């Protein structure tokens, strides 16, 4: 149910990003970034806005913030808008 059940190297599930969020976590950030396509010049799809500011859950910020980096994007700011800091229980 949560991403930290022990799945690592030499397991049956393929290696991916693992989050430290609890089951049904409810912490969300507020991020800002630019992400060019870097593939439109051989697909010829439509043009889209690449300047984004959105709320992203804690459960996906590791994967999203790690995907923006792989695809050449640049993160301009990130803040926590929902949730407590160093809370032991009460993140659900």
């Amino acid at each position: 149910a949560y991403d930290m059940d022990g799945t690592g190297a030499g397991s049956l599930e393929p290696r991916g990003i693992k989050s430290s969020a609890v089951e049904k976590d409810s912490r969300c950030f507020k991020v800002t970034f630019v992400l060019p396509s870097q593939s439109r010049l051989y697909t010829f799809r439509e043009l889209q806005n690449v300047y984004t500011t959105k709320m992203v859950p804690f459960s996906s910020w590791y994967a999203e913030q790690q995907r923006i980096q792989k695809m050449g994007g640049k993160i301009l700011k990130v803040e926590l808008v929902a949730g407590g800091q160093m809370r032991s229980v009460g993140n659900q």
Binding site: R15, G16, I17, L41, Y42, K70
Partner: protein, 160 residues
């Protein structure tokens, strides 16, 4: 370079390079000094290959330069000899970084659409590079003629 392809190919799987991937870096890095002499010979003949290749494209495509074409003129023909300081320059960048990325990040990507803005026959430059490969073979021996040969074909296949 070849190390940036292995490091990037492994990073999206979230792992270290494998035993066969680390061998790709080892063999390439050991052949780095032979690639460092080959591209120096090319830089010494950059002014002469144009002299042989410029002869070829115009006897093969004489309709481009004659009156009746739109882009010819005594005005622009002055700085002609500085041209292949750009294209075979990329061929020296690709001979050093032993792969096609410098020839593909620059050059091939967007080269067709780049010329279609004008309406120029794109088949001319495809033949311009093919005759360029004909030019680079006489100023170079036969042993390292097989070493720079596969790098030209990628430009023809990329433009086509």
């Amino acid at each position: 370079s070849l190390v940036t392809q292995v490091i990037l190919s492994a990073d999206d799987e979230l792992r270290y390079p494998t035993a066969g991937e680390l061998e790709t870096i080892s063999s390439y890095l050991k052949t780095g000094e032979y690639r460092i002499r080959l591209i120096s010979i090319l830089q010494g003949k950059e002014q002469e290959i144009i002299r042989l290749a410029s002869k070829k494209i115009f006897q093969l495509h004489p309709e481009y330069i004659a009156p009746g074409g739109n882009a010819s003129g005594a005005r622009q023909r002055a700085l002609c000899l500085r041209d292949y300081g750009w294209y075979l320059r990329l061929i020296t960048y690709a001979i050093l970084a032993g792969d096609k990325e410098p020839l593909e990040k620059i050059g091939i990507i967007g080269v067709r659409e780049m010329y279609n803005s004008l309406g120029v026959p794109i088949i001319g430059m495809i033949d311009a590079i093919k005759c360029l490969k004909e030019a680079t073979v006489e100023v170079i021996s036969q042993e390292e003629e097989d070493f720079v040969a596969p790098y030209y074909d990628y430009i023809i296949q990329g433009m086509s």
